[PDB]
């Protein structure tokens, strides 16, 4: 039931998403090992993901969380990089998409920095990079990221030594 709708580059919506992508690139402590060496992206396409069933699943849970947190969903727009992005857009997020070994616990991880999510496009630690060239810093092969609506509710603040 998922359809993908292309946004025009002349559309303000496209432009906003591109600017969130570009403006949240940072340097990483691995020198580029996992995600590659870059300061900016070439955005090729931005598609809206439309699935009525998945949306209803989302808004029902949002309402439960909002009520439990005294009428505050604490909803954000956040990046997600994953080798399962094709599965996610069709079937929704679930336990198969969790990072079991993640340092903040076994759950589904999202980033404010686009470049942090870019580190997971080819798997944990960038895996072995792109399929065609086995290059984690491949400048040829097309990558995909999700920019997602995420309900945080009451969020536990964990400072991390990173």
């Amino acid at each position: 039931g998922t359809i993908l709708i292309d946004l025009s580059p002349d559309d303000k919506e496209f432009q906003s998403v591109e600017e969130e992508m570009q403006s949240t690139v940072r340097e990483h402590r691995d020198g580029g090992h996992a995600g590659g060496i870059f300061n900016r992206y070439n955005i090729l396409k931005i598609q809206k993901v439309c699935n009525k069933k998945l949306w209803e699943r989302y808004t029902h849970r949002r309402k439960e969380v909002s009520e439990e947190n005294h009428n505050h969903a604490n909803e954000r727009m956040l990046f997600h990089g994953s080798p399962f992005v094709n599965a996610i857009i069709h079937k929704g997020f679930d336990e198969r998409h969790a990072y079991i070994g993640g340092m903040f616990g076994a759950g589904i991880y999202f980033a404010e920095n686009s470049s942090k999510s870019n580190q997971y496009v080819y798997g944990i630690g960038g895996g072995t990079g792109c399929p065609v060239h086995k290059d984690r810093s491949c400048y040829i092969c097309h990558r995909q990221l999700l920019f997602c609506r995420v309900t945080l509710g009451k969020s536990f603040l964990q400072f991390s030594a990173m």
């Binding site: 604490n74 999202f110 309900t151």
Partner: protein, 47 residues
């Protein structure tokens, strides 16, 4: 998949050493995220 901390719906992981690093967030229910935009891109080689 683990459970969220008691009385909480997510975790905010906030880097405390690299002051330019932004937050990371963890949810423990798939129904708390919706994949709204799909972005296709290349990283660009610095000049």
């Amino acid at each position: 998949m683990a459970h969220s901390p008691p009385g909480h719906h997510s975790v905010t992981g906030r880097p405390s050493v690299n002051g330019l690093a932004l937050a990371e967030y963890v949810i423990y229910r798939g129904e708390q995220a919706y994949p709204e935009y799909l972005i296709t891109y290349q990283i660009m080689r610095p000049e």
